[PDB]
Amino acid sequence: MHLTARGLTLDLSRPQVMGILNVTPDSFSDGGCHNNLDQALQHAQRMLSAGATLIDIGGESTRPGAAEVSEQEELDRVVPVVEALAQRFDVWLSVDTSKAAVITESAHAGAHLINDIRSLQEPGALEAAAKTGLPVCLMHMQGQPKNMQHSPYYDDLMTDINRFFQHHIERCVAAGIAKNKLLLDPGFGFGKNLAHNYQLLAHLSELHHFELPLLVGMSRKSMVGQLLNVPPQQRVIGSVACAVIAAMQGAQIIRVHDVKETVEAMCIVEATRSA
Amino acid sequence: MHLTARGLTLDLSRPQVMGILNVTPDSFSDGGCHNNLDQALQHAQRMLSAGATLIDIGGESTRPGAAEVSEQEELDRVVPVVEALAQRFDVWLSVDTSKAAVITESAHAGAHLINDIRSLQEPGALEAAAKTGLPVCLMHMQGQPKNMQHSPYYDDLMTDINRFFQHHIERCVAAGIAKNKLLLDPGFGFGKNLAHNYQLLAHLSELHHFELPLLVGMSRKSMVGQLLNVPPQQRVIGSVACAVIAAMQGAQIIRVHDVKETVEAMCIVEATRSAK
Ligand SMILES: C=C1CN=c2nc(N)[nH]c(=O)c2=N1
Ligand SMILES: C=C1CN=c2nc(N)[nH]c(=O)c2=N1
Ligand SMILES: Nc1ccc(C(=O)O)cc1
Ligand SMILES: Nc1ccc(C(=O)O)cc1
Ligand SMILES: [Mg+2]
Ligand SMILES: [Mg+2]
């Protein structure tokens, strides 16, 4: 009932908020905001103060149409941030990356969790993650960020997601990553149209059958934007609503831009579930 | 599913947002704000633009420890606002009142719904409501605003609420108000402690067994305040979270101060519910 890494524990009996720290110039909602060290550190402290129990550090945007980032570039964006945070704060450090080198160097810098939207499918990533001994989040995606929003299609969405997770859990275990080190994310917005996203949100509780923690990320995405017809920074309410729905179905970790609001909503959820 | 009055159709297949217009000096979160005509009309416009499909007008705060308000004082606060709103906007008007004179005179002025927190129990209120033919919302409360929060107690909370509703549905039907014109509100914060409120919220879907629309009011209340430790105006997120939880369980009407936020949240709720 707790996740663990390097002496840290995380309470999975109540919703946990993961604060998003983009260290990119081009992230869809906040590129260029926390792009440098003192600003990143400031934003992380703000999220911690607002009640985040994990900080997700990402140096590669993976939005629809996102450009490629070189190994060295991603390393330069990510590892000094991990290092500075690891030295200052008692909090879970998640690294949103798919690269083997970033996985390894971030682990050396003191990271706790590998958040890979590509589920360790890049060359060397599976072996690199294995050697870290750290927990790993596997995420469902149809296609790649360059083409995932070109005609998304499913015979049955939940069936595909289940098969994907079953296949990749097996890969991880065979590579020496214990099943209990794994987290599952059905990947909202990743090769899924508006209907798919809400179908998934409506059916989210079905994914508990794997008996692994669920992590979800809907914050400021087009699944909110397309319904409300508002820019990313004005999607806080819609994003919080999605968080509440997900958490009411027992999703354990919520990945968000707007930590304070999400934390406040999770309090209400927690009080409702425990009654 | 489908409610109508005065030739206007309230779709209840999707969550509806009721916007709060307090015409009082002492309401718990906003007393004195929209306390005069021009500003009442101003505030109602803003709620309409934000997507509210009902405007709830209330001239008597009923917060824990609220003072009584004279009949003449209530009529003066409420009826000129109802009048101006009916003569100006194409929307459902709700009156949050318990007084027979206020019921009658508000209906005369063009109201669409009687929102009574005392469930027509005041002398002459039941008869006055009958004579209008208008839909009535019946709310559960233990005690009275003056004492309701002095040791709220229930053997079983949901059982009591059901029994309360069964009895007052019967009172209304007998007096000539047809069942299909009734709405039920379990009355969050009315003679209920923190535990009771969240028990009620967790079990809200059980009340669908009456096959009557549910209205709920949690906006900015102490059930949010006690958890978040922020003042009434900072309770928007907590209030929206309660609204989402309620609407996911199929509650049809959500009574709120912050309309824009609630409407956006309801859009997300609607997209989720209709995705089988
Ligand atoms: C935009 C992003 C970037 N990284 C993510 N990581 C996870 N695990 N889940 C997401 O939904 C997600 N969205
Ligand atoms: C504070 C108030 C004033 N009027 C209300 N009316 C209804 N129907 N429900 C409420 O929760 C409510 N709370
Ligand atoms: N990485 C992603 C960023 C944003 C979205 C989205 O807005 O749907 C999807 C994926
Ligand atoms: N009329 C009411 C006003 C406020 C509250 C509350 O804050 O719980 C309850 C009733
Ligand atoms: Mg990112
Ligand atoms: Mg009031």
TrEMBL record, chain B:
EC id: 2.5.1.15
Keywords per UniProt: Folate biosynthesis, Magnesium, Metal-binding, Transferase
Pfam families: Pterin_bind
Reactions catalysed according to its record: (7,8-dihydropterin-6-yl)methyl diphosphate + 4-aminobenzoate = 7,8-dihydropteroate + diphosphate
One GO CC annotation: cytosol
Enzyme class: transferase
Sequence positions that bind Mg(2+): N22
Keyword Chloroplast set for record: no
Keyword Membrane: no
Requisite cofactors: Mg(2+)
InterPro entries per the UniProt record, alphabetical: DHP_synth-like, DHP_synth_dom, DHPS, Dihydropteroate_synth-like_sf, Pterin-binding_dom
GO molecular function term, any single one: dihydropteroate synthase activity
Involved pathway(s): Cofactor biosynthesis; tetrahydrofolate biosynthesis; 7,8-dihydrofolate from 2-amino-4-hydroxy-6-hydroxymethyl-7,8-dihydropteridine diphosphate and 4-aminobenzoate: step 1/2
Subunit structure and binding partners: Homodimer.
Its biological purpose: Catalyzes the condensation of para-aminobenzoate (pABA) with 6-hydroxymethyl-7,8-dihydropterin diphosphate (DHPt-PP) to form 7,8-dihydropteroate (H2Pte), the immediate precursor of folate derivatives.
Family, per entry: Belongs to the DHPS family.
Listed name of the protein: Dihydropteroate synthase
